[PDB]
Design an enzyme around this catalytic site. Structure first.
Site, PDB file in Angstrom:
ATOM      1  N   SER A  14       0.826  -1.181   0.000  1.00 22.11           N
ATOM      2  CA  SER A  14       0.000   0.000   0.000  1.00 22.11           C
ATOM      3  C   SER A  14       0.872   1.246   0.000  1.00 22.11           C
ATOM      4  O   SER A  14       2.026   1.213   0.430  1.00 22.11           O
ATOM      5  CB  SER A  14      -1.004  -0.008   1.177  1.00 22.11           C
ATOM      6  OG  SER A  14      -0.467   0.581   2.347  1.00 22.11           O
ATOM      7  N   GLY A  16       0.935   5.487  -2.021  1.00 17.24           N
ATOM      8  CA  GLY A  16       0.298   6.566  -2.790  1.00 17.24           C
ATOM      9  C   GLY A  16      -0.718   6.044  -3.783  1.00 17.24           C
ATOM     10  O   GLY A  16      -1.711   6.700  -4.061  1.00 17.24           O
ATOM     11  N   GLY A  18      -2.708   3.518  -3.280  1.00 18.87           N
ATOM     12  CA  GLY A  18      -3.786   2.792  -2.583  1.00 18.87           C
ATOM     13  C   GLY A  18      -3.315   1.506  -1.903  1.00 18.87           C
ATOM     14  O   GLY A  18      -2.202   1.445  -1.386  1.00 18.87           O
ATOM     15  N   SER A  19      -4.166   0.481  -1.910  1.00 18.43           N
ATOM     16  CA  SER A  19      -3.874  -0.811  -1.286  1.00 18.43           C
ATOM     17  C   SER A  19      -4.065  -1.912  -2.291  1.00 18.43           C
ATOM     18  O   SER A  19      -5.100  -1.960  -2.945  1.00 18.43           O
ATOM     19  CB  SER A  19      -4.798  -1.047  -0.078  1.00 18.43           C
ATOM     20  OG  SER A  19      -4.465  -0.180   0.997  1.00 18.43           O
ATOM     21  N   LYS A  35      -6.871  -3.840  -6.517  1.00 19.75           N
ATOM     22  CA  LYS A  35      -6.349  -2.532  -6.168  1.00 19.75           C
ATOM     23  C   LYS A  35      -7.467  -1.618  -5.686  1.00 19.75           C
ATOM     24  O   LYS A  35      -8.431  -1.376  -6.403  1.00 19.75           O
ATOM     25  CB  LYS A  35      -5.617  -1.922  -7.370  1.00 19.75           C
ATOM     26  CG  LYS A  35      -4.840  -0.627  -7.062  1.00 19.75           C
ATOM     27  CD  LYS A  35      -4.337   0.034  -8.344  1.00 19.75           C
ATOM     28  CE  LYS A  35      -3.242   1.055  -8.044  1.00 19.75           C
ATOM     29  NZ  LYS A  35      -2.374   1.349  -9.237  1.00 19.75           N
ATOM     30  N   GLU A  84      -4.527  -7.996 -14.016  1.00 21.05           N
ATOM     31  CA  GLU A  84      -3.672  -9.145 -14.191  1.00 21.05           C
ATOM     32  C   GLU A  84      -2.610  -9.256 -13.091  1.00 21.05           C
ATOM     33  O   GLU A  84      -2.050  -8.250 -12.625  1.00 21.05           O
ATOM     34  CB  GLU A  84      -3.037  -9.055 -15.569  1.00 21.05           C
ATOM     35  CG  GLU A  84      -1.745  -9.790 -15.718  1.00 21.05           C
ATOM     36  CD  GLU A  84      -1.137  -9.606 -17.076  1.00 21.05           C
ATOM     37  OE1 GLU A  84      -1.419  -8.573 -17.736  1.00 21.05           O
ATOM     38  OE2 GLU A  84      -0.375 -10.512 -17.473  1.00 21.05           O
ATOM     39  N   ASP A  91       8.907  -7.363  -8.769  1.00 19.16           N
ATOM     40  CA  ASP A  91       9.099  -6.044  -9.344  1.00 19.16           C
ATOM     41  C   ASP A  91      10.597  -5.766  -9.579  1.00 19.16           C
ATOM     42  O   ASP A  91      11.448  -6.426  -8.978  1.00 19.16           O
ATOM     43  CB  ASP A  91       8.322  -4.939  -8.591  1.00 19.16           C
ATOM     44  CG  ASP A  91       9.005  -4.452  -7.321  1.00 19.16           C
ATOM     45  OD1 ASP A  91      10.168  -4.793  -7.040  1.00 19.16           O
ATOM     46  OD2 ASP A  91       8.363  -3.672  -6.594  1.00 19.16           O
ATOM     47  N   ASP A 130       5.081   7.819 -14.504  1.00 20.52           N
ATOM     48  CA  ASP A 130       5.755   7.270 -13.336  1.00 20.52           C
ATOM     49  C   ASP A 130       6.552   5.991 -13.672  1.00 20.52           C
ATOM     50  O   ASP A 130       6.525   5.007 -12.932  1.00 20.52           O
ATOM     51  CB  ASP A 130       4.739   7.059 -12.203  1.00 20.52           C
ATOM     52  CG  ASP A 130       5.393   6.874 -10.842  1.00 20.52           C
ATOM     53  OD1 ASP A 130       6.533   7.352 -10.620  1.00 20.52           O
ATOM     54  OD2 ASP A 130       4.745   6.234  -9.987  1.00 20.52           O
TER      55      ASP A 130
HETATM   56  O1  LIG Z   1      -0.885  -0.906  -9.367  1.00 20.52           O
HETATM   57  C1  LIG Z   1      -1.149  -1.681 -10.428  1.00 20.52           C
HETATM   58  O2  LIG Z   1      -1.601  -1.184 -11.457  1.00 20.52           O
HETATM   59  C2  LIG Z   1      -0.816  -3.114 -10.348  1.00 20.52           C
HETATM   60  C3  LIG Z   1      -1.191  -3.996 -11.374  1.00 20.52           C
HETATM   61  C4  LIG Z   1      -0.839  -5.343 -11.310  1.00 20.52           C
HETATM   62  C5  LIG Z   1      -0.084  -5.807 -10.256  1.00 20.52           C
HETATM   63  C6  LIG Z   1       0.322  -4.950  -9.226  1.00 20.52           C
HETATM   64  C7  LIG Z   1       1.103  -5.145  -7.992  1.00 20.52           C
HETATM   65  C8  LIG Z   1       1.767  -6.423  -7.604  1.00 20.52           C
HETATM   66  C9  LIG Z   1       3.139  -6.368  -7.256  1.00 20.52           C
HETATM   67  C10 LIG Z   1       3.846  -7.511  -6.930  1.00 20.52           C
HETATM   68  C11 LIG Z   1       3.201  -8.740  -6.974  1.00 20.52           C
HETATM   69  C12 LIG Z   1       1.859  -8.818  -7.346  1.00 20.52           C
HETATM   70  C13 LIG Z   1       1.138  -7.674  -7.672  1.00 20.52           C
HETATM   71  C14 LIG Z   1       1.177  -3.906  -7.385  1.00 20.52           C
HETATM   72  C15 LIG Z   1       1.847  -3.572  -6.102  1.00 20.52           C
HETATM   73  C16 LIG Z   1       2.425  -2.302  -5.921  1.00 20.52           C
HETATM   74  C17 LIG Z   1       3.038  -1.991  -4.725  1.00 20.52           C
HETATM   75  C18 LIG Z   1       3.080  -2.924  -3.692  1.00 20.52           C
HETATM   76  C19 LIG Z   1       2.491  -4.175  -3.848  1.00 20.52           C
HETATM   77  C20 LIG Z   1       1.870  -4.506  -5.044  1.00 20.52           C
HETATM   78  N1  LIG Z   1       0.480  -2.997  -8.141  1.00 20.52           N
HETATM   79  C21 LIG Z   1      -0.043  -3.594  -9.262  1.00 20.52           C
END
Ligand SMILES: O=C(O)c1cccc2c(-c3ccccc3)c(-c3ccccc3)[nH]c12
Length: 268
Positions: A14, A16, A18-19, A35, A84, A91, A130
């Protein structure tokens, strides 16, 4: 309903944006990311839906370089986005944290894929705003990268931008000094920061004054040609920066590995 068709898993993170929760689509067990974004935290709107959703719909396709929005829901104080989720996945930030500076062959492969993904967005009228290691997901099995988090993005336009809420250390010196940038050249700058990050294992600039000075010091051994591409992307004058075509035609960018070879040599 929503919690009917998705089995919610643990919180992935979580901030900026969101969660974000791990999830699974109940029907066919497809791994998804769930999300949650607060309406009070959204500044950009209109189709009335968050910009992020507009942006995600615009870039949706069979091309696996940009994350796919699978569905979205509205709630009294929030929107919920079902995206997805690759599995297994890491990451780029975590990946670089674990392995340190990337071998040039791997950075070339990864960088190439980010470029194709960003070109895809620009071609669809979308500016991400970003681009950074934290917003890049690696499909560890296929060796394919995914651009995520369009929550700071905008429609691509040819006129100046005077708003920005991406990551400061990836923002160009013209944003720092004047609060003005144009989309393409600001994206090229953040791509230069990204490539440096990949090959040195950290970002080149921390403070505003370093960004505006734009002097690149290499902390790791990096080829003459890679340093050239980097310094070119990081030209102080926006118009001195390469086009996407110029980046991909750069001597350093030639003979890129396929995603599957990249996974075989470097990931598996
Ligand atoms: O934010 C999106 O569009 C999005 C779109 C798709 C995946 C993500 C995952 C994510 C990252 C690792 C493993 C699984 C999901 C994350 C995320 C970001 C910060 C911390 C934790 C998760 N965000 C997404």
């Amino acid at each position: 309903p929503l919690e009917s068709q998705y089995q919610v898993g643990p919180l992935l993170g979580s901030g900026g944006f969101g969660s974000v929760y791990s999830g699974i689509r109940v029907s066919d067990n497809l791994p998804v990311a769930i999300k949650h974004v607060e309406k009070d935290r959204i500044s950009d709107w209109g189709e009335r839906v968050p910009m992020e959703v507009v942006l995600l719909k615009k870039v949706s396709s069979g091309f696996s370089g940009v994350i796919r929005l699978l569905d979205w829901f509205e709630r009294p104080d929030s929107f919920v986005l079902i995206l997805e989720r690759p599995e297994p996945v890491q990451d780029l930030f975590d990946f670089i944290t674990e392995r340190g500076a990337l071998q040039e062959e791997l950075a070339r492969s990864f960088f190439w894929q980010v470029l194709e993904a960003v070109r895809h967005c620009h071609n669809c009228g979308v500016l991400h705003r970003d681009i950074k290691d934290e917003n890049i997901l690696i499909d560890l099995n296929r060796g394919e990268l995914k651009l995520i988090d369009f929550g700071s993005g905008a429609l691509l336009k040819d006129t100046v931008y005077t708003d920005f809420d991406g990551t400061r250390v990836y923002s160009p010196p013209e944003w720092i000094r004047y609060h003005r940038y144009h989309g393409r050249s600001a994206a090229v700058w953040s791509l230069g920061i990204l490539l440096y990050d990949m090959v040195c294992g950290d970002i080149p600039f921390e403070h505003d004054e370093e960004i505006i000075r734009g002097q690149v010091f290499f902390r790791q051994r990096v080829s003459s040609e890679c340093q050239h591409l980097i310094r070119w992307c990081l030209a102080l004058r926006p118009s001195d920066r390469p086009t996407f075509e110029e980046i991909q035609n750069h001597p350093w960018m030639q003979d890129v590995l396929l995603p599957q070879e990249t996974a075989e040599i470097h990931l598996h």
